[PDB]
Design a protein around this ligand. Structure first.
Ligand SMILES: Cc1ncc(COP(=O)(O)O)c(/C=N/CCOP(=O)(O)O)c1O
Ligand SMILES: Cc1ncc(COP(=O)(O)O)c(C)c1O
Lengths: 451, 452
């Protein structure tokens, strides 16, 4: 659904003469006031991770002072190259980079997906050069992020997805079973996006060191949450570089790092690994050209906002934020188990996947959507999840959620036949065959791009 | 060389307690005042494309109002999904999208490189599904951007680079020669980055339609320059979708589109092509997940800055900008041919590659660097180039350049033995073997990432 089709002029052609800056800003600001109550008041799962208007006004100043930065030119903006070096270093330390000998290194990327993609490409390129593996395989849980499939398709890696156990954590045995001599990497999520549970990293990491291959830890969600939850006295095993089997880790500075959107860190245990990531061309008439990541020209300013957010918070700000989130979490989970028909999937710390055996969970979800809740629809198995952020730690938000949740279950128990709005969509999507979904969604992405 | 290693505290660990916002900003603003004179006063080739402090203050407001946008969620920020749809549409029209039947479609990407990569992956995936080609080849000029090699390595495409002619434009014949039944795409640059010259697109496009394969036009540099140069009455053949053989085109809204860094457009002629780009997963316990491009979470705000910059300029602002640039160009080229020892490579419109047969061009370049000029070092053949922007259209900038260029040649003619600063580096790099460069540069990228 396209909200501003009518309220605002549509442009499928450049205006013959330029429109005034004062007006363009006003058009955009208006859309700002329309869309920002949804995430600000706490109705959104994930999406906005900090939300505080002063922390945002702060990062916008950081962007403004670095707007022109392009780290393709480290000699014009050595300031940005500094930021990137320090975000990578501070993040390395945070994830047990010292307990590895201090050989831990990385680069700043554009997001979790790039981190994962880069990593897969690295392990693929390394395996071919050293172990001579020319038809590579990777082994991850079925809960590992969909970005892994993306890497499989792009780089020509055969991806093998293993099943989970009763707690929705990875099945470490089935992983051993699927390893072949062509397997170049195994991965574990900390936590996985679907259910918020942390795969058995120590076990997977060990399994990896055993067969002399890589182990990647997808800590894109947990990187900036888990280390602080551990010091707050929660049940979190070592997930990072403390474990010796773990060869790489990815973490999102734009997620729970509270940077602005468009930054992430990929970390490798040794430099001889990192080096397979760099792209270099020496034979090009355009001169010497190299890039650490996928991109050539990058938004230097976003690397600044990641750096500035990490310094403005420090170990205190993260410890504080993490507590306020995990508090709201434990409190929401209690309110959910308290409700009869619902169950929680596995044992999440702050990303809660709620399902039902008796009711149609998708209509429950739709009933929440009726009150303004923008939640995530899962399937295999059917459920919806809410990933908690600082936006849900504000006064009365977890309460409103549980209050609206009760009324929503009561309504669906009265009419188990009810399936309104999006409920029928999420439900068909569950049952439909891959190649049919692949086609309808393709039409949906085309609808997004219409003028 | 790391400038702030001493003046500012280095952080290899999160500060136990958070540092004040007032202070962090001051640290960054200081670095801003140190680095911004270089590109602002016009010493930089490319890098900053507009530079005007009001146009920048404007786009920063655009970013500020959209900072939170992440177009992975089109239902939370339908505003951004709108911007993206319209940047893609306005850009399509600009590059002859109507003359194609109105089936021209695209997506907004993160930069030229992603556009190119996405395209290569599309043609690879299409060729396998329709033409059953399981060991794909691509054929581009040796001047085509290095991003093409990157796609070759990533996606497993065999890349074949053809030679150029006397004008440094593509050799259309050698391209035909290298086409096999496994060739899935050919490309032409408009202009190529090295020399600023426009490959023979009409001819290449035709060559492509002939063999029933794709033709991609790398207009990342020229997309927002060439269409306006054509209406200003310059010698530019049709390079875009007017030609029927051309199946895709890439253009950088963050370059000569004067958006903020981190946006670009990839355009396809028909939707059945675009569709091979989309990534979709239906079997994932995380639910339905799709993405048009490489990224999942994106900076929505950068899509806004591209949109806002295009609207704030319109066909007038581009026509004006393009004139002021091409004027400065023609004026700089005359000043260069005027100088005895130097020659210009091919016939560039605004990206000038200057070489020398008698002198060591790298020391010429170093002599310019002495006066503050941050230029691009080319090789194969040895030269340096300057890509002109609005920053070089300001008063007296092309003049200072020619003035410093004369003094620089005079100095190198007096001491042909001289090789100071970077000159010896660019020169070794020219002669060294690929695998040696590959190793030294790897050490250089590691040096960038060190903290003292
Ligand atoms: C475990 C895991 N792995 C990879 C990713 C992808 O990272 P991305 O490219 O979206 O920055 C996610 C995020 N997944 C959700 C990104 O959208 P959001 O609601 O704003 O956080 C992830 O959770
Ligand atoms: C002519 C040309 N093509 C492609 C690219 C790649 O774009 P980017 O560096 O912005 O990713 C550039 C920079 C370029 O100048």
């Amino acid at each position: 659904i396209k909200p501003y089709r009518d309220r605002f002029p549509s442009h499928a052609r450049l205006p013959r003469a330029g429109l005034p800056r004062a007006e363009i800003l006003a058009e955009i600001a208006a859309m700002g006031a329309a869309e920002s109550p949804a995430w600000r008041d706490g109705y959104a799962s994930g999406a906005v991770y900090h939300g505080d208007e002063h922390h945002i006004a702060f990062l916008n100043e950081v962007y403004a002072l670095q707007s022109q930065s392009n780290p393709l030119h480290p000699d014009l903006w050595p300031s940005t190259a500094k930021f990137e070096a320090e975000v990578v270093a501070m993040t390395a330390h945070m994830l047990g980079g010292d307990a590895a000998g201090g050989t831990v290194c990385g680069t700043v990327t554009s997001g979790g997906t790039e981190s994962l993609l880069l990593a897969m490409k690295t392990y693929r390129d390394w395996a071919r050069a050293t172990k001579g593996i020319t038809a590579p395989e990777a082994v991850v849980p079925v809960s590992a992020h969909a970005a892994f499939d993306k890497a499989a398709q792009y780089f020509g890696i055969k991806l093998v997805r293993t099943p989970l156990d009763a707690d929705y954590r990875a099945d470490v045995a089935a992983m051993r079973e699927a390893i072949t001599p062509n397997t170049v990497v195994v991965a574990g999520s900390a936590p996985g996006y679907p259910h918020g549970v942390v795969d058995p990293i120590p076990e997977i990491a060990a399994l990896a060191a055993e067969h002399g291959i890589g182990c990647h830890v997808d800590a894109c969600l947990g990187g900036f949450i888990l280390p602080w939850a551990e010091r707050l006295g929660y049940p979190v095993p070592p997930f990072d570089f403390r474990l010796e089997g773990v060869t790489s880790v990815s973490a999102d500075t734009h997620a729970y790092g509270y940077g602005a959107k468009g930054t992430s860190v990929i970390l490798y245990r040794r430099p001889d690994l990192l080096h397979y990531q760099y792209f270099i061309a020496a034979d090009w008439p355009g001169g010497l050209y190299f890039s650490p990541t996928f991109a050539g020209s990058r938004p230097g300013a976003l690397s600044a906002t990641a750096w500035a957010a990490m310094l403005s918070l420090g170990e205190e700000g993260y410890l504080d934020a993490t507590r306020r989130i995990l508090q709201a979490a434990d409190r929401l989970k209690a309110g959910v188990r308290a409700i009869p028909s619902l169950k929680i999937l596995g044992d999440p710390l702050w990303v809660i996947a709620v399902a039902s055996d008796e009711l149609n969970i998708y209509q429950v979800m739709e009933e929440m959507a009726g009150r303004g809740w923008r939640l995530n629809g899962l399937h295999r198995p059917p459920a919806f999840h809410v990933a908690l952020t600082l936006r849900h730690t504000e006064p009365g938000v977890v309460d409103r959620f549980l209050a609206d949740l009760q009324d929503a279950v009561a309504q669906v128990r009265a009419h188990p036949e009810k399936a309104t709005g999006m409920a029928p969509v999420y439900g068909m999507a569950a049952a439909a065959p891959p190649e049919l979904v692949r086609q309808v969604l393709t039409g949906f992405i085309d609808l997004l791009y219409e003028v």
